[PDB]
Amino acid sequence: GNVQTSVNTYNITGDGNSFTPTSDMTSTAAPAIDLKPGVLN
Amino acid sequence: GNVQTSVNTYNITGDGNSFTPTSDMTSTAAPAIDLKPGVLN
Amino acid sequence: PTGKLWRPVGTSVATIDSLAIVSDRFGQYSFVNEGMRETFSKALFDINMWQPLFQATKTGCGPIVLSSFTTTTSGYVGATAGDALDNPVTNGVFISTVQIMNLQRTIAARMRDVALWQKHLDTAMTMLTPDISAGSASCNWKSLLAFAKDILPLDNLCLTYPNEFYNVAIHRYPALKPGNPDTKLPDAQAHPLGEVAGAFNAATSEVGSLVGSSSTLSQAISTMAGKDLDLIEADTPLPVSVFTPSLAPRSYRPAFIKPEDAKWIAEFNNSSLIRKTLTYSGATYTVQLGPGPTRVIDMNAMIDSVLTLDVSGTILPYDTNPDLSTSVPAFVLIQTSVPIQQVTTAANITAITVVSAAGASAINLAINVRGQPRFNMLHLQATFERETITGIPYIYGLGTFLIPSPTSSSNFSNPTLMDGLLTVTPVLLRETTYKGEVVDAIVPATVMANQTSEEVASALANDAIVLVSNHLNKLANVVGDAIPVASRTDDSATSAIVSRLAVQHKLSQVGQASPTPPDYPLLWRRAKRAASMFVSNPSLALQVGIPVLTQSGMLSALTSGVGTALRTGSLGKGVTDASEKLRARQSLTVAKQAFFDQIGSLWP
Amino acid sequence: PTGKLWRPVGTSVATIDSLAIVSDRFGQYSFVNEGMRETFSKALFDINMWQPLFQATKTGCGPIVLSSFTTTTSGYVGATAGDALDNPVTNGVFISTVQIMNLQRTIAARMRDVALWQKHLDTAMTMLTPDISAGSASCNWKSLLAFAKDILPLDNLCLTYPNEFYNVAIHRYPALKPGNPDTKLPDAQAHPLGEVAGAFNAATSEVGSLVGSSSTLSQAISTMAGKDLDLIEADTPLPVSVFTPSLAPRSYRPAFIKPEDAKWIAEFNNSSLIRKTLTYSGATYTVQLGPGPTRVIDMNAMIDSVLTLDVSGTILPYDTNPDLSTSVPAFVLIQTSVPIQQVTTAANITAITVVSAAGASAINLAINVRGQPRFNMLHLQATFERETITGIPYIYGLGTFLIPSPTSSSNFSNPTLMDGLLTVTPVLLRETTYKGEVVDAIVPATVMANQTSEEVASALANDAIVLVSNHLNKLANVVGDAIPVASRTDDSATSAIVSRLAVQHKLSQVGQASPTPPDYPLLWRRAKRAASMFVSNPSLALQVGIPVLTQSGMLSALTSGVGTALRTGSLGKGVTDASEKLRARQSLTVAKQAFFDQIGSLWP
Amino acid sequence: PTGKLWRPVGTSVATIDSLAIVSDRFGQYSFVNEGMRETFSKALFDINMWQPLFQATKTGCGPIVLSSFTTTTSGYVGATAGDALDNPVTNGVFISTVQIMNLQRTIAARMRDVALWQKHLDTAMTMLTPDISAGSASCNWKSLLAFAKDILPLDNLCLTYPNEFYNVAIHRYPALKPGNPDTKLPDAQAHPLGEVAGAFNAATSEVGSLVGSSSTLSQAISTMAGKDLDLIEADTPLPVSVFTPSLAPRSYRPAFIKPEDAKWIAEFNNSSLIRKTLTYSGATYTVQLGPGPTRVIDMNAMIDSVLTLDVSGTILPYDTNPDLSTSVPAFVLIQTSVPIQQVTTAANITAITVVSAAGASAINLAINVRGQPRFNMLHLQATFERETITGIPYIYGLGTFLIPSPTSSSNFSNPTLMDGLLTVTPVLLRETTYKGEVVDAIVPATVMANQTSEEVASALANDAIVLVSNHLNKLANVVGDAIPVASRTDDSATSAIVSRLAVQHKLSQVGQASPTPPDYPLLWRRAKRAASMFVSNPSLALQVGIPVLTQSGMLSALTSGVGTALRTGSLGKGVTDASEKLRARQSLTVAKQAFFDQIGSLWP
Amino acid sequence: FDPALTAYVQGDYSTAAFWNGIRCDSATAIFTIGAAAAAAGTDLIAFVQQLIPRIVAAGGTRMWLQLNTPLYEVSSLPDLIEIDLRDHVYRFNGGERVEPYADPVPLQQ
Ligand SMILES: *C(=O)CCCCCCCCCCCCC
Ligand SMILES: *C(=O)CCCCCCCCCCCCC
């Protein structure tokens, strides 16, 4: 968790972060991308 | 394979044709066209 | 926008009432949103492709442009005056009803036309696997052709139009590259109409196949949300409906199932015999309840089903005790006064109904199979109904024998035909059964590690256990399928469990010398076999005494992990073992290249 | 538009022939229609996300813009000169072949890159279920981190780049909300790149889950149209193909199946024994056809299959009648002159061929298992073929014994090894079998309520019955799945049936005092168990004597209901029992909050 | 473009670093690409439809326009500053987070609202099958209505709002055509809001149903790429993971399985008996290894599973040899010094551990079922673990009896309880087993035609054979399903094989008089049954001695054919037997018209 | 490099494990075979005694191994290679690296 600084807009050990799931936003990316012949074209 | 000539831009027995699969382009037309109620509209 | 187009019937000022579906002599113009044109274009595109075969055979009628079925009207387009008012579209492209009819029956008529040819092109195309999945591999064209000139049966259509099918083909198989006219050489690149689609299906060596790995995920995601794998070990009443129990009729072998191993089956464990009588069809028979305990299907705790006790291949010793022969085997209910397992003698048995006898005694139902006469496969069968047993505290279904005359010979026989393969089929899904009671809702978490080794295999068709097993089984195929719970990859599944074991073993260490700092290399590995043992035999998680798997955390834990795990797979999940998988594909193309080499010699 | 772009090769005037696929040094520009950009953008979007990990590890090469693989050409774009003429596109966005190659191998190369990291991020993410489905629940970040600092095995990648993975993570888990730099506090809202998708997957308390309930429907709709559940009880010849019979090899136990319970199996019911002889491999053996009826597989009405009669665990009494030992058990055909069931004595049996004997007599195939010597599991096996029995009116397959010397001991034995588990496997799907005849088409409606209790379980692998059972079984899972035939919701399924019962019971009341006005509360409930009994055990609808289900209306009725029923589910079908389902999800989040509470204490 | 919108925080010049996610008091504006509006419009469209029922019942709140949740911001929109820089969008349409919340909970709240009504509309709609699939068929409206006025149970919602539901209905059922107000007659055409979708689902007589045939293909394509049917007979090491083995616990009947028919089970074939002893729970018992060979589960070559030997219904002759009674049946390991099958007498058996005994002797576990006392269904059960047997060259699992006192009576008994149905369940998927060895990878092609008839049915749960069977089984359902391997249509499958037989039979003819020119009509037909026999019983392709199917070419061939075959089906694949299929649909509509005719009379 | 044409396997071939799933019709152990015998601290003859059979199993028709045996003479080079005779071994640059050797005849048979 050693401080980084700019590589990415957020530090992990950064000030006031917060793990907190909300039944509202089910985390996630994009797995079901459609590529099948007819559907991709 | 008898010569045709114009019906279609290519003769089958035509000069220098070439059957040659490439793992790169898996031959495919359009089978999975989506038509289900919600998805077609 | 979407829906049918509307226009101000009252003119000019278009309010939420001065509108009206602009119908007319052509039907109603429905708007053709951007994506819906993708389909009808993608459908027509796949037909235009067959252009060279339509002319050759004088069918068809020119290329089908989707711009021949639409129009360029303009107005407000919604689903109802109210909402259509917020979609003013100008010169949009709508297709009138009567048109939505042709674009339909045209794509249908043409679809037949091609579907046929397209079938001939195929028996000839695939008739030389034009598809490899690693590196390339040619096959000198002359041979190839001069070869199929043979194989192809005299009723194809690839022999009547070679380069009328070939031109259609070139656009479907980037294997066949036509020789360019003004340099008389191939092209390196192959340009089939499915240019992109065919590019994105090739088994890319970096990661198996995007089209594969992509679906195997969306597929699993479907199930995960669908059946309701989520909430799999929820601790609270759930309507049986929530378990979509269907096609669920399990069969057994009672007269073997211990009474404590499955509440729905009590036994007459009494000292002597309990010969009773009953006038069935005039003739008086004697139900036996012989020497042994004679386990009988209890009627209460028996969800109005369709009990069908099959008695076949099972021994029928009418050879020794002649007493047995002559007795028509028959499934019979038995209402007892005092509760069974307390019913001592005949005077205790209230009444006995022959719910289904077998016409013809035990000497026509037989069939000698090497001395030991067996039972000609026949199915006796009641149709028990929850309420036909209202009030009646004690009543049991028993597939016994009905001896026409008890004797000394049948003094150690005990005619229970229950050794046969009985098949109960719940005929009324809404009601389930648990621990001996009939309910309308289960409490999942309750059924976990609560059954014994066989308090599971002895479950009654469509009972909590059998439901909390049909459920885990889905969730078991989502992990088995999508997640890699079968390699040393400490996957999302076996990972959700590891975090529970830690948090668990960590607090059990709190208070007292804490001489053992948690392990982890040992925990990861213990939870790996736990998640693995689950995917393996989903059932186990119901049996008392299964390491890890049966602690309240897991499962409730597992699933919700596997859950988010599927909702992030990416697309290139196939990168797993995409090395040996790749090396195996090259292995095949090397052997298939070997094939083309013979096609290339034999038919020069 | 769609397809490759074309341009007037003859210049200016573009007619249906002065066109030509505009190919060149880059390959052929294929048009990139609006939706097809959604994919390649959605694919690249999922890769750009991993930007912070690409720089950290010096791989990658900057963000992949889809605008680097395309171009802005203009011309006519279609599938063929003819139809491409009706799609004049100006400055459209096309991707050249050689480009369609990189956007491919790039998304593939990068896909591997991320697929790997993305796997490490996960074993750590799901390693603390960042997903609940009812209300919220936090877990003080310090602890959480200081905790995973442990668990995570030394070869992850979330320990080598914490806030290089964290930045990737924040965009995939709206659970982790990063603390804002200039107010040093969270954000309430969580902004993960999958903003919308993640919003529309949350288990919305009003109705289960849109992503779930939506698919469970489109899924069922697929089947309904696919297999051809529609037309399930059609009354007219249907090619077996229409039933896509596959992976269909059913096994039995003949020598038990009554001849009338399944046409494909006749028996030698004759007075005495019928000892015949036959020189097999020199040695002369005697086929017995012993004391009992000896049911034998008939050859006609036997779809050229792969009969494999297994004889194992079954008794082998060579202990008593020594006659039995020494005889090599073997499946043998038996051509009889007079039709069986009329074949009295030896002179009647034309010939007997040992289609497959077992090397080594009956005293090496044995194995003592408590007195009663059993049969060491072995499989005898013919390969019957429709025409190898041409002309031959009578011929039967019999898995008998072939005794090397009949004696008085084997005078009541009857060596039929048919008591073994025979497994016929139709090896030629096109041809089915019905009521004893071989056909190419079934008549569905005919097979309904036409079999008996066991004229079904005794069906022959890939015969009408077994086909008109494999079919109902699909339709049975569409209702079981999509429709709610398992709750008091008088669903579309049990509703289609109720309307039949009414219309039916209503005309049966017409003519005569009509003293009974139709019931309805009783009809609804009767049809509810009818539709329910179907979902339960799809098979039943074939057995003569099943209430409601077997009247010609139903099924033909049911399906066409269930049909339209799926084509309207809406999306929020999950509203069914979405109350207890919800209350169960809150139940889980309350228990999972309990977990985070320990992670929060143990590792402070 | 896609993703959240960004804007130059540093102003004016946007440098790919200046850009920052434009967040604020509303959350972050995420772009709403063209297609993603199709969904939210298609979702809202399906809700607006229910407008007439929202007003009637004072719920709702006006029509939901998607243009109420979005905005018209403008900036650069990507997934990360770097790539967002290449998507300058002006006045695009973005939806802010807090909005992505309402459009969500609104569509959710409304979705419940309608989901309910929509359910009542249905029990009434489908309650008169408004869907036929061939020609038309009316039913005079008066009757129809006056009829449902009955059937519909008093708690619907179609009785409280007839023409408030009717108006919703008219848009979902193109069956109900409302009578036009100013000509008081129908319309011929029916204009339901689903105008197009409903047009493209009708079972078009030319080809079954586009919506069906289309999916049955994309469905098969999914599998083909997914599981990895491709590469099905690859000749090279493949991680078991590549076979996604799940829910895989097979059960047997050892003490019958010949040792050579399945490496994981050796036998003590020794002359006399081998009575050994062992102090188990104080009491000294004698393991027998009786008269016969006593086949025992070998421990090596036994993937750490969960062996659960069930002993029930199986004979228990404590009646004769009293020696048997009193002995607690129990699964026991047996470590022998000299390798089994070479272990002669007691001094040879190193030690014997009772891994799981059954409390209570053999006279409480019994239950008389007609003389022959059986075993009360009970499950003994070890949990074998790869390494608990490290070093130990010889050790065997044996479910024997443990007699408390061997006697002359048990001199021909042999107490092996293995005749019971043992069920091994691999509890650690990663490791498979082949030919007796434990491995981590299979070599597919090796397992083809390498097992014998029963060297397959005797396979050990999750062993190469059982894996190279679970695999073919998928590929077997893709052909069975999509491809027409069940009609005389010489399909792509049976075609791929024919080309192999030719190329094969053609070179075998090369060199020597070549007196036989290849056949073809006979080859097509031979390969047709070969491809057919495969779809039929996928397994066979593992057994040595199966015509065609087992030559190295086929399968590797087949699949790669079936492969490309699915990737071209077109859409109108349903044209196959679309004639009788059609004629059967007209058959149903003629019978359903017959129904409407009664609804039309009875309730005038 | 195109995967089909060029493949790369990590780990040594000296260890039995490495040989699982690697089939090539021809192997070439030039510049390594000598270092493996030294690394695995084993006898040169005994080393190739286990390698050659693996190449046979690996499915190899041809083999080329830069073995270091004095077939012409047991004479050595003053600065390039010293041939310690007490223990069959070389000394390329006397020390820089030491690798065991075999004899022309014994290794030949
Ligand atoms: C420094 O690296 C100390 C360890 C803290 C984080 C390491 C990885 C565990 C937490 C993951 C954060 C990113 C998403 C899980
Ligand atoms: C003339 O027709 C001689 C036969 C050569 C071609 C006939 C059909 C076989 C080759 C098919 C080419 C088109 C796609 C397979």
Short mmCIF file of N, CA and C in Angstrom, two decimals, chain D residues 249-289:
data_model
loop_
_atom_site.label_atom_id
_atom_site.label_comp_id
_atom_site.label_asym_id
_atom_site.label_seq_id
_atom_site.Cartn_x
_atom_site.Cartn_y
_atom_site.Cartn_z
N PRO D 249 -29.83 -43.38 -26.17
CA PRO D 249 -29.73 -44.83 -26.07
C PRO D 249 -30.28 -45.40 -24.75
N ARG D 250 -31.57 -45.74 -24.71
CA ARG D 250 -32.19 -46.26 -23.48
C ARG D 250 -31.91 -47.73 -23.18
N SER D 251 -31.78 -48.06 -21.90
CA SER D 251 -31.50 -49.44 -21.47
C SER D 251 -32.66 -50.05 -20.67
N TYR D 252 -32.80 -51.38 -20.75
CA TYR D 252 -33.85 -52.09 -20.02
C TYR D 252 -33.41 -53.21 -19.11
N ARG D 253 -34.37 -54.20 -19.09
CA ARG D 253 -34.39 -55.48 -18.34
C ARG D 253 -35.46 -56.46 -18.89
N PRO D 254 -35.40 -56.92 -20.18
CA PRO D 254 -36.38 -57.89 -20.77
C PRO D 254 -36.47 -59.19 -19.99
N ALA D 255 -37.17 -60.18 -20.54
CA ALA D 255 -37.35 -61.40 -19.76
C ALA D 255 -38.18 -61.02 -18.53
N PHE D 256 -38.69 -59.79 -18.62
CA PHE D 256 -39.56 -59.23 -17.59
C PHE D 256 -40.63 -58.42 -18.30
N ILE D 257 -40.25 -57.65 -19.32
CA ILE D 257 -41.22 -56.84 -20.07
C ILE D 257 -42.29 -57.73 -20.72
N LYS D 258 -43.55 -57.57 -20.33
CA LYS D 258 -44.60 -58.38 -20.94
C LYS D 258 -44.65 -58.09 -22.45
N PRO D 259 -44.94 -59.12 -23.26
CA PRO D 259 -45.01 -58.94 -24.71
C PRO D 259 -46.01 -57.88 -25.15
N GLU D 260 -47.17 -57.81 -24.49
CA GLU D 260 -48.18 -56.82 -24.88
C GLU D 260 -47.83 -55.41 -24.39
N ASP D 261 -46.92 -55.31 -23.42
CA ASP D 261 -46.53 -54.00 -22.89
C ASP D 261 -45.51 -53.29 -23.78
N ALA D 262 -45.05 -53.98 -24.84
CA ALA D 262 -44.06 -53.42 -25.76
C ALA D 262 -43.82 -54.32 -26.96
N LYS D 263 -44.54 -54.09 -28.04
CA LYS D 263 -44.48 -54.88 -29.26
C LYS D 263 -43.13 -55.46 -29.68
N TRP D 264 -42.03 -54.73 -29.44
CA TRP D 264 -40.71 -55.21 -29.84
C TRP D 264 -40.16 -56.35 -29.00
N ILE D 265 -41.01 -57.19 -28.44
CA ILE D 265 -40.50 -58.28 -27.62
C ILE D 265 -41.52 -59.39 -27.39
N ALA D 266 -41.42 -60.43 -28.21
CA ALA D 266 -42.34 -61.58 -28.15
C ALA D 266 -41.79 -62.71 -27.30
N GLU D 267 -42.66 -63.61 -26.84
CA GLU D 267 -42.20 -64.72 -26.00
C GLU D 267 -42.62 -66.12 -26.46
N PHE D 268 -41.74 -67.09 -26.20
CA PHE D 268 -41.97 -68.49 -26.56
C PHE D 268 -42.87 -69.19 -25.52
N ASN D 269 -44.11 -68.75 -25.35
CA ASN D 269 -44.98 -69.41 -24.37
C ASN D 269 -45.44 -70.79 -24.87
N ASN D 270 -44.61 -71.81 -24.59
CA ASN D 270 -44.89 -73.19 -25.00
C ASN D 270 -44.88 -74.15 -23.81
N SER D 271 -45.64 -75.24 -23.91
CA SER D 271 -45.74 -76.23 -22.84
C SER D 271 -44.41 -76.71 -22.25
N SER D 272 -43.76 -77.65 -22.94
CA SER D 272 -42.49 -78.21 -22.48
C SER D 272 -41.28 -77.34 -22.84
N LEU D 273 -40.09 -77.94 -22.83
CA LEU D 273 -38.87 -77.24 -23.20
C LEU D 273 -38.63 -77.38 -24.68
N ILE D 274 -37.79 -76.54 -25.25
CA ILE D 274 -37.53 -76.63 -26.68
C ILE D 274 -36.04 -76.73 -26.97
N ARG D 275 -35.38 -77.75 -26.42
CA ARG D 275 -33.94 -77.90 -26.65
C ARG D 275 -33.58 -78.10 -28.12
N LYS D 276 -32.79 -77.16 -28.65
CA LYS D 276 -32.34 -77.20 -30.04
C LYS D 276 -30.83 -77.37 -29.97
N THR D 277 -30.18 -77.54 -31.12
CA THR D 277 -28.72 -77.67 -31.14
C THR D 277 -28.12 -76.76 -32.21
N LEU D 278 -26.80 -76.61 -32.20
CA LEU D 278 -26.12 -75.75 -33.17
C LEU D 278 -24.61 -75.86 -33.01
N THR D 279 -23.92 -76.16 -34.10
CA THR D 279 -22.47 -76.27 -34.05
C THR D 279 -21.87 -74.87 -34.06
N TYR D 280 -21.40 -74.43 -32.90
CA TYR D 280 -20.79 -73.12 -32.76
C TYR D 280 -19.31 -73.27 -32.41
N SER D 281 -18.44 -72.96 -33.36
CA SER D 281 -17.00 -73.07 -33.14
C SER D 281 -16.66 -74.55 -32.92
N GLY D 282 -17.21 -75.40 -33.78
CA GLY D 282 -16.98 -76.83 -33.66
C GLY D 282 -17.93 -77.42 -32.64
N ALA D 283 -17.63 -77.18 -31.36
CA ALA D 283 -18.45 -77.67 -30.26
C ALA D 283 -19.96 -77.50 -30.48
N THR D 284 -20.73 -78.52 -30.11
CA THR D 284 -22.18 -78.47 -30.27
C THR D 284 -22.87 -78.09 -28.96
N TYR D 285 -23.60 -76.98 -28.99
CA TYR D 285 -24.31 -76.52 -27.80
C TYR D 285 -25.82 -76.63 -27.98
N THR D 286 -26.55 -76.55 -26.87
CA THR D 286 -28.00 -76.64 -26.93
C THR D 286 -28.66 -75.40 -26.35
N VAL D 287 -29.33 -74.65 -27.22
CA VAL D 287 -30.09 -73.49 -26.75
C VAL D 287 -31.29 -74.08 -26.02
N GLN D 288 -31.73 -73.49 -24.90
CA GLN D 288 -32.77 -74.16 -24.09
C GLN D 288 -34.21 -73.71 -24.30
N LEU D 289 -34.55 -72.44 -24.05
CA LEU D 289 -35.93 -71.94 -24.14
C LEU D 289 -36.72 -72.63 -23.02
#
